[model samples]
Target: AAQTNAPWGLARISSTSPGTSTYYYDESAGQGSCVYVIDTGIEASHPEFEGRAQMVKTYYYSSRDGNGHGTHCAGTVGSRTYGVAKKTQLFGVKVLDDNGSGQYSTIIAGMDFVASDKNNRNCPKGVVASLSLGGGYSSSVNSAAARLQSSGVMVAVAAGNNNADARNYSPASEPSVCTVGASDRYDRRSSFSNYGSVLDIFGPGTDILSTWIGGSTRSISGTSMATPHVAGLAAYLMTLGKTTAASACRYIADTANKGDLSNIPFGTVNLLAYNNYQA
Candidate 1:
């Protein structure tokens, strides 16, 4: 009887309950995918995790979440009640400090760690790194992501909140990443979201409700919030036997709904997101 009425969730409701849809997907939600959140930090004790979160590595802030960004993002990724991939295995990779800011080098190191240390992390089909941080574009970051993608690690990053072209942002500018932009509950591109050809998808970001630091809950808005939805869906597809990075990307791109957002134009093109409906 679990029904998702979130605007983003409504767009893809091909079936009401967990049963085989026309697309041959069970819609059991995420149980087999592993998602590593590289951000401020994650509170493993948050009720939503339900003892499913793991601490893979922490580069700063002593792995404690004071800013609450990572906890919210992680919740959207796999919280038992408030997530996209509801049962996904979450890995908390703290790269940013308590100040809610991270350096480019620190992020690169986190991704590098995921590229190498995931075997011991217990993900059956490799890992997907969800990054909500961004800085100026860097070739170094692009190179590092390329290597990780080559090694079968999927990466998703925020398209930035500057409301400018996403190509100017780092990691998001990286072609190998699934750069995500923000869309309001109306499913329209958020005014604060960066847009450009580099952005591969859009997701619900404005006023999103999810888990917070200190075993709480709150609403947040930004490209940061949007990125996790795509990350969760990426994990969902992989959990549903998406397997490799290439096929996973191809499947999501093919299944995305390009209808509702056709009228709202942003940056000469309208990029619409999906609600991960199986059919």
Candidate 2:
């Protein structure tokens, strides 16, 4: 795979914040790690990601790309150097089909696959799973999240874009999952991002730039974008031997720049502080 300057470039941008940049710089820059993105199918051919992306598994729970939500979300998490984990391997599990929706069973099955890969030694160890898509909370989904967590798999999920409460959705609402909320360049909550005590952290989401289908680039907004920023940070943390999910969360949370928490409904999540804390 070709090495990328993107990670270094992002580190430069993230560094200006001191609190946020330190984490990205210390944790994930150009590290050859692997992350599983359980969402829409990725455009494996995109130059930004091509040669760098490794699709370990896939499933088409829905038809064609009806809304392009899944594709966009995947891009945010692992698209080329533009995504959070640009150098990490991606397992594109198509649980949400082209319409950007899937049955709960389908989503659960995808999680099961990741949890059950213990016997397969080829499966990457310390894999962090990112779930940007979610729906109404359910016991089954919560149980799945717990299973993944218990197995040492770190799962990051969106707190939902409802702008209501973090408890409004499954996975994110589940204690086992790391609930990620949205913030802008200024590190404030996006008007559409859901917030609550359940929110575990925040990431760049509002008008963020990332890959789109067919070699295009666009800036989109949502908690979906923020979830991957955390996911990528987790991947970087794992590189420093913060293997356990709880430790990873603590490393990110405890190290964040608390000074930014003021006026921020849920609280401020400083990536740079989190990274420096680990060091």
Candidate 3:
């Protein structure tokens, strides 16, 4: 069973396995919930994403794929084939373009557009934004993130994957934002995930199996993937009436599978239990 939870199967291998259970989608329940993916543009035509992408707008900050990072990150957060909230509407904001890199000003502009789009006529209200990109910590960026949060939009960001102190990252380090680190199948933090007092929670990111470019699938590892797991969970919680990021984080932390972290580096965050545990 332990080995089965490795690499290729990690994403679905939750903290607890039970007898076969049926899952249902109450689309009407989450119909108004909107999530923004600020990364490389998704392969919008992918079967898993067809009819599910609410790409109200697209911003190209780069011209080519540099490391395939944005696509991989998108798969983890919103891919119809292997994402946590497959039924949720997604807005793809191409901040990094195809090259997997962009200027800070360009990225901030993307954030501003999503937060200040006057034509709420086309976007959903009370939307959640997911950002897998990060850089050295900055107060100005933090202020910008706080402004978005104040607008009733919750933001989730990946703690840098450098395995160093997390205080070094910008938006993730901001107190108003939700910072997610990566964990493996065994409920241990990923070897590369940054850790610190600011880290809010953990999600499955090590060897995660998800959709890839070119109609294929692969197992990739990084805090980028973990960040979306939290985003998805947040969306679900919002459906349950927990709207603010702080409330959602408290619910997740208080309800997570803490016992699993007995021997792990950082405390364990039981995503499976947090997501499926019924009160």
Instruction: Give lDDT tens digits, candidate 1, residues 45-97.
Output: 88889998877689863778888999999998888767777778999989998
TM-score of 3: 0.81
Per-residue lDDT of 1-279 in model 2, one digit per residue for the tens?
223344322342344452233224443542555566777766665687766554455566332334455556666656655665556666566677766777899899988887776335343436778888888878899889878877877888888998777776888888867888876656556788887887777776777667676667677888877777777777766765655555776667765655453236534333322344322
Clash pairs (backbone) in predicted model 2: 14-21, 19-272, 19-273, 20-272, 22-272, 23-272, 64-98, 66-98, 255-273, 255-274
Q: How well does candidate 2 score on lDDT at residue 168?
A: 62
lDDT score at residue 115, model 2, on the 0-100 scale? 77
Model 3, 153-218: lDDT tens per residue?
Answer: 778888878887788887888877788888776556688988777777777777777666676677
Most TM-score-accurate candidate: 1
RMSD of each: 4.0, 4.1, 4.5
Off by over 4 Å in 1: 4-27, 262-269, 275-279
Best by lDDT: 1
